[PDB]
Coordinates of all heavy atoms in Angstrom, one line a residue:
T3 N 0.8 -1.2 0.0 CA 0.0 0.0 0.0 C 0.8 1.3 0.0 O 0.3 2.3 0.3 CB -1.0 0.0 1.2 OG1 -1.7 1.2 1.2 CG2 -0.2 -0.1 2.5
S4 N 2.1 1.2 -0.3 CA 3.0 2.3 -0.4 C 3.6 2.4 -1.8 O 4.2 1.5 -2.3 CB 4.1 2.2 0.6 OG 3.6 1.8 1.9
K5 N 3.4 3.6 -2.4 CA 3.7 3.7 -3.8 C 5.2 3.5 -4.1 O 6.0 3.9 -3.2 CB 3.3 5.1 -4.4 CG 3.4 5.2 -5.9 CD 3.6 6.6 -6.3 CE 2.3 7.4 -6.4 NZ 1.3 6.6 -7.2
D6 N 5.5 2.9 -5.2 CA 6.9 2.5 -5.5 C 7.8 3.7 -5.5 O 8.9 3.7 -4.8 CB 7.0 1.7 -6.8 CG 8.3 1.2 -7.1 OD1 9.3 1.6 -6.6 OD2 8.4 0.2 -7.9
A7 N 7.5 4.7 -6.2 CA 8.4 5.8 -6.4 C 9.0 6.3 -5.1 O 10.0 6.9 -5.1 CB 7.7 7.0 -7.1
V8 N 8.2 6.1 -4.0 CA 8.8 6.4 -2.7 C 10.1 5.6 -2.5 O 11.2 6.1 -2.3 CB 7.8 6.2 -1.5 CG1 8.5 6.1 -0.2 CG2 6.8 7.3 -1.6
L9 N 9.9 4.3 -2.4 CA 11.0 3.4 -2.0 C 12.2 3.4 -3.0 O 13.2 2.7 -2.7 CB 10.5 2.0 -1.9 CG 10.2 1.6 -0.4 CD1 9.1 2.6 0.1 CD2 9.6 0.2 -0.4
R10 N 12.1 4.2 -4.1 CA 13.3 4.4 -4.9 C 14.1 5.6 -4.4 O 15.3 5.5 -4.0 CB 12.9 4.5 -6.4 CG 12.3 3.3 -6.9 CD 13.1 2.0 -6.6 NE 12.7 1.0 -7.5 CZ 13.1 0.8 -8.7 NH1 14.0 1.8 -9.2 NH2 12.7 -0.2 -9.5
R11 N 13.5 6.8 -4.4 CA 14.2 8.0 -4.1 C 15.0 7.9 -2.8 O 16.0 8.6 -2.6 CB 13.2 9.2 -4.0 CG 12.2 9.0 -3.0 CD 11.4 10.3 -2.8 NE 10.5 10.1 -1.6 CZ 9.2 9.8 -1.7 NH1 8.6 9.7 -2.8 NH2 8.5 9.8 -0.5
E12 N 14.6 7.0 -1.9 CA 15.4 6.7 -0.8 C 16.3 5.5 -1.2 O 16.1 4.4 -0.9 CB 14.5 6.3 0.4 CG 15.3 6.2 1.7 CD 15.5 7.6 2.2 OE1 14.7 8.5 1.9 OE2 16.5 7.8 3.0
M13 N 17.4 5.9 -1.9 CA 18.4 4.9 -2.2 C 19.7 5.7 -2.6 O 19.7 6.9 -2.9 CB 18.0 4.1 -3.4 CG 18.7 2.8 -3.5 SD 18.2 1.8 -2.1 CE 16.5 1.6 -2.4
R14 N 20.8 4.9 -2.5 CA 22.1 5.5 -2.8 C 22.9 4.5 -3.7 O 24.0 4.2 -3.5 CB 22.9 5.8 -1.6 CG 22.1 6.8 -0.7 CD 22.1 8.2 -1.2 NE 21.4 9.1 -0.3 CZ 20.2 9.7 -0.7 NH1 19.7 9.4 -1.9 NH2 19.6 10.5 0.1
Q15 N 22.2 3.8 -4.6 CA 22.8 2.8 -5.5 C 21.9 2.8 -6.8 O 20.9 2.2 -6.8 CB 22.9 1.5 -4.8 CG 23.0 0.3 -5.8 CD 24.1 0.5 -6.8 OE1 24.0 1.2 -7.8 NE2 25.3 0.0 -6.4
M16 N 22.4 3.5 -7.8 CA 21.6 3.7 -9.0 C 21.7 2.4 -9.9 O 22.9 2.0 -10.1 CB 22.0 4.9 -9.8 CG 22.3 6.1 -8.9 SD 21.1 6.1 -7.5 CE 19.6 6.5 -8.4
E17 N 20.6 1.9 -10.3 CA 20.6 0.7 -11.1 C 21.5 0.9 -12.3 O 21.8 2.0 -12.8 CB 19.2 0.5 -11.6 CG 19.0 -0.7 -12.5 CD 17.5 -1.0 -12.7 OE1 16.7 -0.4 -12.0 OE2 17.2 -1.9 -13.5
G18 N 22.1 -0.3 -12.8 CA 23.0 -0.2 -13.9 C 24.3 0.4 -13.6 O 24.6 1.5 -14.0
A19 N 25.1 -0.2 -12.7 CA 26.3 0.4 -12.2 C 27.1 -0.7 -11.6 O 26.8 -1.9 -11.7 CB 26.0 1.6 -11.3
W20 N 28.2 -0.3 -10.9 CA 28.9 -1.2 -10.0 C 28.3 -1.2 -8.6 O 27.8 -0.2 -8.1 CB 30.3 -0.8 -9.9 CG 30.5 0.7 -9.7 CD1 30.3 1.4 -8.6 CD2 30.8 1.6 -10.7 NE1 30.5 2.7 -8.8 CE2 30.8 2.9 -10.1 CE3 31.1 1.5 -12.1 CZ2 31.1 4.0 -10.8 CZ3 31.3 2.7 -12.8 CH2 31.4 3.9 -12.1
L21 N 28.3 -2.4 -8.1 CA 27.7 -2.6 -6.8 C 28.6 -2.1 -5.7 O 29.7 -2.6 -5.5 CB 27.4 -4.1 -6.5 CG 27.0 -4.6 -5.1 CD1 26.0 -3.7 -4.5 CD2 26.6 -6.0 -5.2
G22 N 28.1 -1.1 -4.9 CA 28.8 -0.7 -3.7 C 28.2 -1.2 -2.5 O 27.1 -0.7 -2.1
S23 N 28.8 -2.2 -1.8 CA 28.2 -2.8 -0.7 C 27.7 -1.8 0.3 O 26.6 -1.8 0.8 CB 29.2 -3.8 0.0 OG 30.0 -3.1 0.9
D24 N 28.7 -1.0 0.8 CA 28.3 0.1 1.8 C 27.2 0.9 1.3 O 26.4 1.4 2.1 CB 29.5 0.9 2.1 CG 29.8 1.9 1.1 OD1 29.7 1.6 -0.1 OD2 30.2 3.1 1.4
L25 N 27.1 1.2 0.0 CA 26.0 2.0 -0.5 C 24.7 1.3 -0.3 O 23.7 2.0 0.2 CB 26.2 2.3 -2.0 CG 27.6 2.8 -2.3 CD1 27.9 2.9 -3.8 CD2 27.8 4.1 -1.6
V26 N 24.6 0.1 -0.6 CA 23.3 -0.7 -0.4 C 23.0 -0.7 1.1 O 21.8 -0.6 1.5 CB 23.4 -2.1 -1.0 CG1 22.2 -2.9 -0.6 CG2 23.4 -2.0 -2.5
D27 N 24.0 -0.9 1.9 CA 23.7 -0.9 3.4 C 23.3 0.4 3.9 O 22.4 0.5 4.7 CB 24.9 -1.4 4.1 CG 25.0 -2.9 4.1 OD1 24.0 -3.6 4.0 OD2 26.1 -3.5 4.2
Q28 N 23.9 1.5 3.5 CA 23.5 2.8 3.8 C 22.0 3.1 3.3 O 21.2 3.7 4.0 CB 24.4 3.9 3.2 CG 23.8 5.2 3.0 CD 24.7 6.2 2.3 OE1 25.9 6.0 2.3 NE2 24.2 7.3 1.8
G29 N 21.7 2.5 2.2 CA 20.3 2.5 1.7 C 19.5 1.9 2.8 O 18.7 2.6 3.4
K30 N 19.6 0.6 3.0 CA 18.8 -0.1 3.9 C 18.6 0.6 5.2 O 17.5 0.7 5.8 CB 19.4 -1.5 4.2 CG 19.0 -2.0 5.6 CD 20.0 -3.2 6.0 CE 19.7 -3.5 7.5 NZ 20.6 -4.6 8.0
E31 N 19.7 1.2 5.7 CA 19.7 2.1 6.9 C 18.7 3.2 6.7 O 17.8 3.4 7.5 CB 21.0 2.6 7.2 CG 21.1 3.3 8.6 CD 20.7 2.4 9.7 OE1 21.0 1.2 9.6 OE2 20.1 2.8 10.7
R32 N 18.8 4.0 5.6 CA 17.9 5.1 5.4 C 16.5 4.6 5.4 O 15.6 5.1 6.1 CB 18.3 5.7 4.0 CG 19.6 6.4 4.0 CD 19.7 7.2 2.7 NE 18.7 8.2 2.7 CZ 18.9 9.5 3.0 NH1 20.1 9.9 3.3 NH2 17.9 10.4 2.9
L33 N 16.3 3.6 4.6 CA 14.9 3.0 4.4 C 14.3 2.7 5.7 O 13.2 3.2 6.0 CB 15.0 1.8 3.5 CG 13.7 1.3 2.9 CD1 13.1 2.5 2.2 CD2 14.0 0.3 1.9
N34 N 15.0 2.0 6.6 CA 14.5 1.7 7.9 C 14.2 3.0 8.7 O 13.2 3.1 9.3 CB 15.6 0.9 8.7 CG 15.1 0.4 10.0 OD1 14.6 1.3 10.9 ND2 15.1 -0.9 10.3
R35 N 15.1 4.0 8.5 CA 14.9 5.2 9.2 C 13.7 6.0 8.7 O 13.3 7.0 9.4 CB 16.2 6.1 9.1 CG 16.4 7.1 10.2 CD 16.1 8.5 9.5 NE 17.0 8.7 8.4 CZ 16.7 9.5 7.4 NH1 15.5 10.1 7.4 NH2 17.5 9.6 6.3
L36 N 13.2 5.7 7.5 CA 12.1 6.5 7.0 C 10.9 6.4 7.9 O 10.0 7.3 7.8 CB 11.7 6.0 5.6 CG 10.7 6.8 4.9 CD1 11.2 8.3 4.9 CD2 10.6 6.4 3.4
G37 N 10.7 5.4 8.7 CA 9.7 5.3 9.7 C 8.4 4.6 9.2 O 7.6 4.1 10.0
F38 N 8.1 4.6 7.9 CA 7.0 4.0 7.4 C 7.0 2.5 7.8 O 5.9 1.9 8.2 CB 6.9 4.1 5.9 CG 6.6 5.5 5.4 CD1 7.0 5.9 4.2 CD2 5.9 6.3 6.2 CE1 6.7 7.2 3.8 CE2 5.6 7.6 5.8 CZ 6.0 8.0 4.6
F39 N 8.1 1.9 7.7 CA 8.2 0.4 7.7 C 8.5 -0.1 9.1 O 8.7 0.7 10.1 CB 9.2 -0.1 6.7 CG 8.9 0.2 5.3 CD1 7.8 1.0 5.0 CD2 9.6 -0.4 4.3 CE1 7.5 1.2 3.7 CE2 9.3 -0.2 3.0 CZ 8.3 0.6 2.7
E40 N 8.6 -1.4 9.2 CA 8.9 -2.0 10.5 C 10.0 -3.0 10.4 O 10.8 -3.2 11.4 CB 7.6 -2.6 11.1 CG 7.8 -3.7 12.2 CD 6.5 -4.2 12.7 OE1 5.5 -3.4 12.7 OE2 6.4 -5.4 13.1
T41 N 10.1 -3.7 9.3 CA 11.0 -4.8 9.1 C 11.6 -4.7 7.7 O 10.9 -4.9 6.7 CB 10.4 -6.1 9.3 OG1 9.1 -6.1 8.6 CG2 10.1 -6.3 10.8
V42 N 12.9 -4.5 7.5 CA 13.6 -4.3 6.3 C 14.8 -5.2 6.2 O 15.7 -5.1 7.1 CB 14.0 -2.9 6.0 CG1 12.7 -2.0 5.8 CG2 14.7 -2.3 7.2
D43 N 14.8 -6.2 5.3 CA 15.9 -7.0 5.1 C 16.3 -7.1 3.6 O 15.4 -7.0 2.8 CB 15.6 -8.4 5.6 CG 16.8 -9.4 5.5 OD1 17.9 -8.9 5.1 OD2 16.7 -10.6 5.7
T44 N 17.6 -7.3 3.4 CA 18.1 -7.3 2.0 C 18.5 -8.7 1.5 O 18.2 -9.7 2.2 CB 19.3 -6.4 2.0 OG1 19.8 -6.3 0.6 CG2 20.4 -7.0 2.8
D45 N 19.1 -8.7 0.3 CA 19.5 -9.9 -0.3 C 20.4 -9.5 -1.5 O 20.3 -8.3 -1.9 CB 18.3 -10.8 -0.8 CG 18.7 -12.0 -1.5 OD1 19.4 -11.9 -2.6 OD2 18.4 -13.1 -1.0
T46 N 21.2 -10.4 -2.0 CA 22.0 -10.1 -3.2 C 22.0 -11.3 -4.1 O 23.1 -11.7 -4.5 CB 23.4 -9.6 -2.7 OG1 23.3 -8.8 -1.6 CG2 24.1 -8.9 -3.9
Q47 N 20.9 -11.9 -4.4 CA 20.8 -13.0 -5.3 C 21.5 -12.7 -6.6 O 21.6 -11.6 -7.0 CB 19.4 -13.5 -5.5 CG 18.7 -12.9 -6.7 CD 17.3 -13.5 -6.9 OE1 16.8 -14.2 -6.0 NE2 16.7 -13.2 -8.0
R48 N 21.9 -13.8 -7.3 CA 22.6 -13.6 -8.6 C 21.7 -14.0 -9.7 O 20.9 -14.9 -9.6 CB 23.9 -14.4 -8.6 CG 24.7 -14.3 -9.9 CD 25.9 -15.1 -9.9 NE 26.5 -15.0 -8.6 CZ 27.8 -15.2 -8.3 NH1 28.7 -15.3 -9.3 NH2 28.3 -15.1 -7.1
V49 N 21.9 -13.4 -10.9 CA 21.2 -13.7 -12.1 C 21.7 -15.0 -12.6 O 22.9 -15.4 -12.4 CB 21.4 -12.6 -13.1 CG1 22.9 -12.5 -13.5 CG2 20.5 -12.8 -14.3

């Protein structure tokens, strides 16, 4: 029930680039800090 465009602008890793581990983690941190959510977990599955 939360529009997608929100959960993008809160990010620090632009699609189509090199993966910066700390960038994704800083993201996750921000996202959690946004307050809307309660439980945020990541993953890095491979294509």
Side-chain angles (χ1 to χ4, degrees):
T3 177
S4 314
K5 192 205 278 306
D6 187 337
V8 165
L9 264 56
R10 295 310 198 79
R11 61 172 189 259
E12 194 77 26
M13 204 64 66
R14 306 285 178 248
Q15 159 53 276
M16 318 327 286
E17 179 167 354
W20 44 81
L21 166 49
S23 89
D24 80 321
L25 309 175
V26 170
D27 277 333
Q28 153 183 346
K30 155 197 166 179
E31 189 60 35
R32 295 192 60 104
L33 199 51
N34 187 305
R35 200 255 306 154
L36 188 51
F38 291 152
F39 295 8
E40 162 176 330
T41 48
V42 292
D43 181 9
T44 182
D45 180 297
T46 319
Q47 93 177 9
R48 179 178 325 207
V49 63

